[PDB]
Amino acid sequence: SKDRISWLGQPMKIEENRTYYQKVSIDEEMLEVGDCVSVIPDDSSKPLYLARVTALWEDKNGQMMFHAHWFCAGTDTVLGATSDPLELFLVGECENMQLSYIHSKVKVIYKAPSENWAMEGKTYFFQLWYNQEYARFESPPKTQPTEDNKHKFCLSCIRLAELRQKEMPKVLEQIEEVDGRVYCSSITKNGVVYRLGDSVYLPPEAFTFNIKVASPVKRPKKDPVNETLYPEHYRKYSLDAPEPYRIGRIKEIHCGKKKGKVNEADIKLRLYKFYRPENTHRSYNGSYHTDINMLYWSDEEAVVNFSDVQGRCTVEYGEDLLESIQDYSQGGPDRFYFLEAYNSKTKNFEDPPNHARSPGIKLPKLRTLDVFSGCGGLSEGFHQAGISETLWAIEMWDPAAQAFRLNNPGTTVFTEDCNVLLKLVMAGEVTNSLGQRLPQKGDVEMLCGGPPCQGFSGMNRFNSRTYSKFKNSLVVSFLSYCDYYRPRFFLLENVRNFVSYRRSMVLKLTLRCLVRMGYQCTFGVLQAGQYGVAQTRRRAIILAAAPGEKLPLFPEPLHVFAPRACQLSVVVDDKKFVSNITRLSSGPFRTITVRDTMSDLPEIQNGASNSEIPYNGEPLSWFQRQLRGSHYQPILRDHICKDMSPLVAARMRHIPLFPGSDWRDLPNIQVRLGDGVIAHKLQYTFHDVKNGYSSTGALRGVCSCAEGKACDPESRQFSTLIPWCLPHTGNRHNHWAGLYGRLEWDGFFSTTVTNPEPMGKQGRVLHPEQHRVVSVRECARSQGFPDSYRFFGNILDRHRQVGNAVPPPLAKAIGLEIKLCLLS
Ligand SMILES: Nc1ncnc2c1ncn2[C@@H]1O[C@H](CSCC[C@H](N)C(=O)O)[C@@H](O)[C@H]1O
Ligand SMILES: [Zn+2]
Ligand SMILES: [Zn+2]
């Protein structure tokens, strides 16, 4: 508390409502703008309030005030209790307070990164600005005070202003008013400038197409079946991706008025509607083969609110292009094209109107060390983004290492445990026992890897031994690499639940470590499906950038994907964290289906083992054109599949081809197997108290536990076409949906695993039509691997390599964001 408060010196500036001072005397103690201060919280449980004094003034009401730019205590960030008690973080929170509330002046030191940062391997301090919505720690702003604002300079305030300014709609150029409306030639929002003739992204529900579309005649309940023949059919008891953006060319821009001035909150756009192929009568079955970025011109017009505009996109008439459709297309983000118009009325494709026509810096590649390199999915995505050149890779497992070499003739691959390699460099060795030159300080500019985080699954609290386990884990080793090499950029990829293992303590300790090193850092979850692959794959991503750099953003989703598979947010101690991703529903491109992925692949049989066979056909999908290339390439590699036992071979043959088919479609029949053995009939000799009798008067239990009792030891039945254990525990596991399931042509892969098993956790691994599990190549296609991408070892080795990889299209997306950080 402060009672004796008097100004010192001449006022710095006198506004109309405030008189500013540079110094004040509080209880005989000098205080200055720039000083830091503590304030005692009313809530005794909260950490002490801490602020920088950015300004001093008197209000007309006789109050002597300061502006408090608050600090954030470590425990109020993701770090929580892992954070240094003495570390503060900057935040965009500030306010006006009565000087008399100050409890004490405090010393707050700015711990700046040493000028020799690359070689580094009781007072409060700070180093980073904390963004609490995205969990980003970043370098403090470089912005300096001007003479004009030197008296009130507040980073927090300046930041909020810049946000507001960027966020808000503004009209750049007015044309004329017509009937209570100002028409404009140019506007802007969120940093994007939209002019007449530009194209725009809009939510699916922004407008409607004029084409008539008869509601799909669908089908009544499927054909009924005999429940003794199909005893598990009843357990089937009880097209979910949104649409991609609407797209339109801007024809006019007009807004209302307030006080004789433009109402910018009321800007409206009139657009020429564009048709995606699947928007025409062609629908989807008519667009399987079309480019994902091809559109159709239309003279249909729509009025839309600027507020709804989700972004800007380029749409060009094919013929006006100075380059090839392909070159133009792969040239930049948000690039579309058309070659025809579409008449909603005659359902015909005319030539585009005349008015639809036009008017008639090389970056250094980052030298990259890829730890836990695997077969190189991560390094491949980066290469594609053009941001890196992986010069060094470490992979303990020989086959994967070899695979890496096959794809990267130029990188020195150390097939070795990362722990012993690091010791070797610590040992001063220039070389490993094989003459291979170890990477040193300065060599490594970008460090990436996916450290297997094996233990830690039991999400109970961190104990003393647990902390030791972690200190000896591979994620820590990876951090050791970061600490020694001090790279410009750091990427740690992992399974989604990296963020939640042991109450998120794994996540918190690695962020704590990155912060301790002085790194900018953040984390997030991404869904590979949203970057152009036909698979559900949520992954964790920890990003870090060296003091002098920009911290990259997480890439905006490119493809629409099943919402249920796009739960990207993570809760840490009840706090919900999200990434900067803005596209929370729709997106530019349609979802990539199983069909796009592997409809061109020649037919193979269970156990097929010929690793080199010819494509006997052309790419059918856009996706297949990308992955197979335009280049001459006649050889289809690794189109081989596991050789399932005769029993399992039999089960597969008996899963029907209807979309969604799985083990519950299996007939309860005896089969003579391909060995001379027998798949027997499963027998039901217990009541399932929950499921009752069937229509054939049959019982439905295969164990005593189906009647509420304990399990009969004798219960288990062997060598039976319908796996015994599935009805056994079906009730407690949503009837094991998906097990022995066929992929749907219209659907997507379940998470691509190291060893696809019909009876594994996610067992929807059967080809949609053929009687076998998916091939190594097919799995590679479910990830984003080009067809030329090589793998190595026996079939299981290759599956392992493919299931382990980061899909290159996901990696590429991340790569481009880092690329943004390389400008200037
Ligand atoms: N101690 C260790 N040292 C080096 N590599 C290890 C290791 N322990 C496990 N690994 C390897 O780390 C890999 C993690 S899988 C990551 C693959 C890579 N990100 C990709 O996109 O392809 C596995 O292949 C595993 O063999
Ligand atoms: Zn402020
Ligand atoms: Zn039982």
mmCIF file of C-alpha atoms in Angstrom, residues 49-292:
data_model
loop_
_atom_site.group_PDB
_atom_site.id
_atom_site.type_symbol
_atom_site.label_atom_id
_atom_site.label_comp_id
_atom_site.label_asym_id
_atom_site.label_seq_id
_atom_site.Cartn_x
_atom_site.Cartn_y
_atom_site.Cartn_z
ATOM 1 C CA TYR A 49 0.940 -9.810 -9.464
ATOM 2 C CA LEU A 50 3.898 -8.323 -11.343
ATOM 3 C CA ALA A 51 3.976 -5.474 -13.815
ATOM 4 C CA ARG A 52 6.130 -3.116 -15.774
ATOM 5 C CA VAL A 53 5.193 0.514 -15.250
ATOM 6 C CA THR A 54 4.727 1.857 -18.784
ATOM 7 C CA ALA A 55 3.177 5.198 -17.828
ATOM 8 C CA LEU A 56 2.362 7.563 -14.962
ATOM 9 C CA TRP A 57 -0.480 10.103 -14.930
ATOM 10 C CA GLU A 58 -3.155 11.881 -12.929
ATOM 11 C CA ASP A 59 -6.863 11.553 -13.739
ATOM 12 C CA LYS A 60 -9.328 14.426 -13.494
ATOM 13 C CA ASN A 61 -10.797 12.600 -10.494
ATOM 14 C CA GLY A 62 -7.611 13.229 -8.524
ATOM 15 C CA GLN A 63 -6.360 9.652 -8.853
ATOM 16 C CA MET A 64 -2.655 9.103 -9.363
ATOM 17 C CA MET A 65 -2.393 6.240 -11.830
ATOM 18 C CA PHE A 66 0.008 3.972 -13.640
ATOM 19 C CA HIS A 67 -0.422 1.640 -16.589
ATOM 20 C CA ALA A 68 0.418 -1.926 -15.620
ATOM 21 C CA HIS A 69 1.749 -4.194 -18.352
ATOM 22 C CA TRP A 70 1.409 -7.467 -16.464
ATOM 23 C CA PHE A 71 3.868 -10.329 -16.518
ATOM 24 C CA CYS A 72 2.735 -13.939 -16.636
ATOM 25 C CA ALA A 73 4.120 -16.237 -13.948
ATOM 26 C CA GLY A 74 5.476 -19.594 -15.079
ATOM 27 C CA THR A 75 2.695 -21.487 -13.304
ATOM 28 C CA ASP A 76 0.145 -19.637 -15.440
ATOM 29 C CA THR A 77 1.554 -21.098 -18.661
ATOM 30 C CA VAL A 78 1.545 -24.644 -20.047
ATOM 31 C CA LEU A 79 4.705 -25.191 -18.009
ATOM 32 C CA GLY A 80 2.722 -25.037 -14.773
ATOM 33 C CA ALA A 81 4.760 -26.359 -11.861
ATOM 34 C CA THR A 82 7.688 -27.322 -14.086
ATOM 35 C CA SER A 83 8.607 -23.694 -14.663
ATOM 36 C CA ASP A 84 11.418 -21.785 -12.980
ATOM 37 C CA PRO A 85 9.922 -20.044 -9.922
ATOM 38 C CA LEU A 86 11.908 -16.908 -10.827
ATOM 39 C CA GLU A 87 11.008 -16.805 -14.534
ATOM 40 C CA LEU A 88 8.398 -14.403 -15.859
ATOM 41 C CA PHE A 89 6.896 -14.247 -19.337
ATOM 42 C CA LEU A 90 5.547 -11.309 -21.305
ATOM 43 C CA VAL A 91 1.826 -11.255 -22.153
ATOM 44 C CA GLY A 92 -0.677 -8.967 -23.829
ATOM 45 C CA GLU A 93 -2.434 -8.075 -20.595
ATOM 46 C CA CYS A 94 -2.304 -4.558 -19.229
ATOM 47 C CA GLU A 95 -4.540 -2.074 -17.438
ATOM 48 C CA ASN A 96 -4.801 1.169 -15.507
ATOM 49 C CA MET A 97 -4.181 0.984 -11.756
ATOM 50 C CA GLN A 98 -3.916 3.297 -8.746
ATOM 51 C CA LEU A 99 -0.298 3.806 -7.750
ATOM 52 C CA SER A 100 -1.403 3.309 -4.137
ATOM 53 C CA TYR A 101 -1.923 -0.401 -4.876
ATOM 54 C CA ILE A 102 1.770 -1.028 -5.448
ATOM 55 C CA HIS A 103 3.248 -3.318 -2.814
ATOM 56 C CA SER A 104 6.913 -2.852 -3.725
ATOM 57 C CA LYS A 105 9.305 -2.132 -6.569
ATOM 58 C CA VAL A 106 10.801 -5.375 -7.910
ATOM 59 C CA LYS A 107 13.879 -6.094 -9.991
ATOM 60 C CA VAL A 108 13.113 -7.767 -13.302
ATOM 61 C CA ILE A 109 16.018 -8.722 -15.533
ATOM 62 C CA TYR A 110 15.788 -9.376 -19.249
ATOM 63 C CA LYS A 111 17.846 -12.536 -19.753
ATOM 64 C CA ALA A 112 18.962 -11.969 -23.350
ATOM 65 C CA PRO A 113 20.389 -14.792 -25.504
ATOM 66 C CA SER A 114 24.178 -14.686 -25.309
ATOM 67 C CA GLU A 115 26.068 -13.540 -28.408
ATOM 68 C CA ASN A 116 27.710 -16.988 -28.230
ATOM 69 C CA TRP A 117 24.400 -18.880 -27.987
ATOM 70 C CA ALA A 118 25.432 -21.455 -30.609
ATOM 71 C CA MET A 119 28.384 -22.508 -28.397
ATOM 72 C CA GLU A 120 26.403 -23.048 -25.178
ATOM 73 C CA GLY A 121 26.017 -26.810 -24.750
ATOM 74 C CA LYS A 122 16.837 -14.320 -6.002
ATOM 75 C CA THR A 123 15.988 -11.937 -8.886
ATOM 76 C CA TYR A 124 13.142 -12.246 -11.430
ATOM 77 C CA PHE A 125 14.008 -12.655 -15.110
ATOM 78 C CA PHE A 126 12.206 -13.066 -18.436
ATOM 79 C CA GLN A 127 13.123 -14.105 -21.979
ATOM 80 C CA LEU A 128 9.937 -14.860 -23.894
ATOM 81 C CA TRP A 129 6.499 -13.543 -24.760
ATOM 82 C CA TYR A 130 3.768 -16.053 -23.922
ATOM 83 C CA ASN A 131 0.688 -16.467 -26.098
ATOM 84 C CA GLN A 132 -1.749 -18.300 -23.831
ATOM 85 C CA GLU A 133 -4.289 -19.155 -26.514
ATOM 86 C CA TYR A 134 -1.809 -21.004 -28.755
ATOM 87 C CA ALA A 135 0.818 -21.863 -26.142
ATOM 88 C CA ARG A 136 3.541 -20.037 -28.049
ATOM 89 C CA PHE A 137 6.679 -18.750 -26.383
ATOM 90 C CA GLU A 138 8.342 -16.257 -28.700
ATOM 91 C CA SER A 139 11.102 -13.653 -28.752
ATOM 92 C CA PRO A 140 10.014 -10.280 -27.345
ATOM 93 C CA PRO A 141 8.990 -7.632 -29.920
ATOM 94 C CA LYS A 142 11.818 -5.460 -31.257
ATOM 95 C CA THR A 143 9.548 -2.399 -31.391
ATOM 96 C CA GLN A 144 11.031 0.713 -29.751
ATOM 97 C CA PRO A 145 9.469 3.864 -28.203
ATOM 98 C CA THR A 146 9.158 6.978 -30.374
ATOM 99 C CA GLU A 147 9.456 10.518 -29.016
ATOM 100 C CA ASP A 148 5.676 10.799 -29.385
ATOM 101 C CA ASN A 149 4.790 7.751 -27.275
ATOM 102 C CA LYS A 150 7.878 7.450 -25.076
ATOM 103 C CA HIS A 151 5.695 8.511 -22.132
ATOM 104 C CA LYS A 152 3.146 5.704 -22.445
ATOM 105 C CA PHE A 153 4.892 3.020 -24.548
ATOM 106 C CA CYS A 154 3.203 -0.340 -23.852
ATOM 107 C CA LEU A 155 3.991 -3.467 -25.891
ATOM 108 C CA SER A 156 0.726 -5.062 -24.744
ATOM 109 C CA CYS A 157 -1.358 -2.113 -25.965
ATOM 110 C CA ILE A 158 0.530 -1.829 -29.236
ATOM 111 C CA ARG A 159 -0.052 -5.515 -29.875
ATOM 112 C CA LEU A 160 -3.799 -5.326 -29.237
ATOM 113 C CA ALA A 161 -4.026 -2.362 -31.599
ATOM 114 C CA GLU A 162 -2.138 -4.158 -34.366
ATOM 115 C CA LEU A 163 -4.429 -7.163 -33.967
ATOM 116 C CA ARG A 164 -7.571 -5.030 -34.123
ATOM 117 C CA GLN A 165 -6.238 -3.146 -37.122
ATOM 118 C CA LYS A 166 -5.364 -6.330 -38.984
ATOM 119 C CA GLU A 167 -8.597 -8.070 -37.949
ATOM 120 C CA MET A 168 -11.071 -5.479 -39.144
ATOM 121 C CA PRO A 169 -12.736 -4.859 -42.542
ATOM 122 C CA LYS A 170 -11.654 -1.663 -44.249
ATOM 123 C CA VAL A 171 -12.461 -0.250 -47.676
ATOM 124 C CA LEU A 172 -9.356 0.770 -49.628
ATOM 125 C CA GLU A 173 -11.101 2.449 -52.568
ATOM 126 C CA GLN A 174 -14.623 3.781 -53.078
ATOM 127 C CA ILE A 175 -16.172 4.240 -56.530
ATOM 128 C CA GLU A 176 -19.630 5.841 -56.346
ATOM 129 C CA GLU A 177 -22.816 5.698 -54.312
ATOM 130 C CA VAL A 178 -25.910 4.254 -55.974
ATOM 131 C CA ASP A 179 -29.248 4.007 -54.186
ATOM 132 C CA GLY A 180 -27.967 4.067 -50.599
ATOM 133 C CA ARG A 181 -24.891 1.943 -51.310
ATOM 134 C CA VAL A 182 -21.241 2.767 -51.881
ATOM 135 C CA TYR A 183 -19.589 0.594 -54.518
ATOM 136 C CA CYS A 184 -15.899 -0.093 -53.974
ATOM 137 C CA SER A 185 -13.038 -1.414 -56.102
ATOM 138 C CA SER A 186 -10.936 -2.665 -53.221
ATOM 139 C CA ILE A 187 -11.235 -3.758 -49.592
ATOM 140 C CA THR A 188 -9.255 -5.639 -46.961
ATOM 141 C CA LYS A 189 -9.475 -7.912 -43.960
ATOM 142 C CA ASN A 190 -6.949 -9.766 -41.819
ATOM 143 C CA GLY A 191 -4.031 -8.641 -43.963
ATOM 144 C CA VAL A 192 -5.561 -9.718 -47.265
ATOM 145 C CA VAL A 193 -6.460 -7.255 -50.018
ATOM 146 C CA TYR A 194 -9.450 -8.146 -52.193
ATOM 147 C CA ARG A 195 -10.062 -6.288 -55.454
ATOM 148 C CA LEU A 196 -12.698 -6.611 -58.167
ATOM 149 C CA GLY A 197 -11.885 -9.651 -60.282
ATOM 150 C CA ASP A 198 -10.156 -11.527 -57.460
ATOM 151 C CA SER A 199 -11.583 -14.846 -56.345
ATOM 152 C CA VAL A 200 -12.724 -15.610 -52.826
ATOM 153 C CA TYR A 201 -13.192 -18.607 -50.517
ATOM 154 C CA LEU A 202 -16.557 -18.947 -48.794
ATOM 155 C CA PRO A 203 -18.254 -21.375 -46.397
ATOM 156 C CA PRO A 204 -20.301 -24.153 -48.068
ATOM 157 C CA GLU A 205 -23.472 -22.415 -46.904
ATOM 158 C CA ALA A 206 -22.588 -18.953 -48.223
ATOM 159 C CA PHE A 207 -24.684 -19.681 -51.304
ATOM 160 C CA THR A 208 -26.550 -22.307 -53.318
ATOM 161 C CA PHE A 209 -26.184 -23.722 -56.832
ATOM 162 C CA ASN A 210 -29.028 -23.261 -59.306
ATOM 163 C CA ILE A 211 -28.783 -26.834 -60.537
ATOM 164 C CA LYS A 212 -31.580 -29.137 -59.428
ATOM 165 C CA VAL A 213 -30.368 -32.133 -57.427
ATOM 166 C CA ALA A 214 -32.773 -34.951 -56.630
ATOM 167 C CA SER A 215 -32.252 -36.300 -53.114
ATOM 168 C CA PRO A 216 -30.392 -39.642 -53.556
ATOM 169 C CA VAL A 217 -32.982 -42.427 -53.907
ATOM 170 C CA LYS A 218 -30.794 -44.331 -51.430
ATOM 171 C CA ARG A 219 -32.181 -47.724 -50.421
ATOM 172 C CA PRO A 220 -34.625 -49.270 -47.925
ATOM 173 C CA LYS A 221 -33.262 -51.607 -45.233
ATOM 174 C CA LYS A 222 -30.819 -54.076 -46.799
ATOM 175 C CA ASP A 223 -31.879 -57.621 -47.671
ATOM 176 C CA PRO A 224 -32.881 -59.707 -44.612
ATOM 177 C CA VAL A 225 -30.801 -62.751 -43.706
ATOM 178 C CA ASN A 226 -30.977 -66.055 -41.840
ATOM 179 C CA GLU A 227 -29.522 -65.406 -38.371
ATOM 180 C CA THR A 228 -28.282 -68.932 -37.847
ATOM 181 C CA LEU A 229 -26.304 -68.623 -41.061
ATOM 182 C CA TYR A 230 -25.247 -65.095 -40.046
ATOM 183 C CA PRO A 231 -25.381 -65.112 -36.205
ATOM 184 C CA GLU A 232 -23.494 -61.839 -35.667
ATOM 185 C CA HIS A 233 -25.242 -59.756 -38.323
ATOM 186 C CA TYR A 234 -27.447 -58.254 -35.609
ATOM 187 C CA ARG A 235 -24.478 -56.484 -34.049
ATOM 188 C CA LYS A 236 -24.473 -54.083 -36.987
ATOM 189 C CA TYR A 237 -27.197 -52.565 -34.774
ATOM 190 C CA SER A 238 -26.349 -48.888 -35.182
ATOM 191 C CA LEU A 239 -20.109 -39.144 -46.037
ATOM 192 C CA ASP A 240 -19.397 -37.185 -42.836
ATOM 193 C CA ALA A 241 -16.768 -34.767 -44.186
ATOM 194 C CA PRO A 242 -18.042 -31.229 -44.783
ATOM 195 C CA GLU A 243 -17.929 -29.616 -48.211
ATOM 196 C CA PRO A 244 -14.877 -27.650 -49.301
ATOM 197 C CA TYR A 245 -15.165 -23.886 -49.770
ATOM 198 C CA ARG A 246 -17.481 -22.196 -52.197
ATOM 199 C CA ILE A 247 -15.459 -20.151 -54.674
ATOM 200 C CA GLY A 248 -16.455 -17.000 -56.512
ATOM 201 C CA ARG A 249 -14.995 -14.247 -58.628
ATOM 202 C CA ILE A 250 -15.744 -10.773 -57.282
ATOM 203 C CA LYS A 251 -17.984 -8.774 -59.606
ATOM 204 C CA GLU A 252 -19.063 -5.881 -57.341
ATOM 205 C CA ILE A 253 -18.348 -4.617 -53.815
ATOM 206 C CA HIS A 254 -20.835 -2.400 -51.962
ATOM 207 C CA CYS A 255 -21.578 -1.394 -48.372
ATOM 208 C CA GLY A 256 -24.095 0.601 -46.340
ATOM 209 C CA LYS A 257 -23.610 3.904 -44.510
ATOM 210 C CA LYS A 258 -23.410 5.371 -41.001
ATOM 211 C CA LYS A 259 -23.364 9.104 -40.226
ATOM 212 C CA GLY A 260 -22.851 9.842 -43.919
ATOM 213 C CA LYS A 261 -19.785 7.606 -43.774
ATOM 214 C CA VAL A 262 -19.094 4.077 -45.043
ATOM 215 C CA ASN A 263 -20.398 1.259 -42.874
ATOM 216 C CA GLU A 264 -17.457 -1.116 -43.093
ATOM 217 C CA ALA A 265 -19.243 -3.705 -40.941
ATOM 218 C CA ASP A 266 -21.711 -3.924 -43.824
ATOM 219 C CA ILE A 267 -19.597 -4.706 -46.887
ATOM 220 C CA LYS A 268 -21.222 -7.091 -49.349
ATOM 221 C CA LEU A 269 -19.781 -8.860 -52.371
ATOM 222 C CA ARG A 270 -21.558 -9.946 -55.535
ATOM 223 C CA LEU A 271 -19.918 -12.977 -57.125
ATOM 224 C CA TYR A 272 -19.875 -15.171 -60.178
ATOM 225 C CA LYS A 273 -20.361 -18.681 -58.753
ATOM 226 C CA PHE A 274 -17.740 -21.282 -59.641
ATOM 227 C CA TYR A 275 -18.682 -24.941 -59.985
ATOM 228 C CA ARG A 276 -16.453 -27.717 -58.750
ATOM 229 C CA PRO A 277 -16.897 -30.751 -60.985
ATOM 230 C CA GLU A 278 -18.817 -32.525 -58.205
ATOM 231 C CA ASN A 279 -21.142 -29.506 -58.018
ATOM 232 C CA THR A 280 -22.359 -30.065 -61.577
ATOM 233 C CA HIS A 281 -24.703 -32.922 -62.491
ATOM 234 C CA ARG A 282 -21.533 -35.019 -62.907
ATOM 235 C CA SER A 283 -21.539 -35.218 -59.126
ATOM 236 C CA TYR A 284 -18.751 -37.349 -57.640
ATOM 237 C CA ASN A 285 -18.913 -40.432 -59.876
ATOM 238 C CA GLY A 286 -18.396 -37.984 -62.711
ATOM 239 C CA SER A 287 -15.308 -36.344 -61.199
ATOM 240 C CA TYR A 288 -13.118 -39.205 -59.972
ATOM 241 C CA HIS A 289 -10.429 -38.382 -62.501
ATOM 242 C CA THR A 290 -10.505 -34.554 -62.507
ATOM 243 C CA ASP A 291 -7.824 -32.331 -60.975
ATOM 244 C CA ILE A 292 -8.665 -31.338 -57.402
#
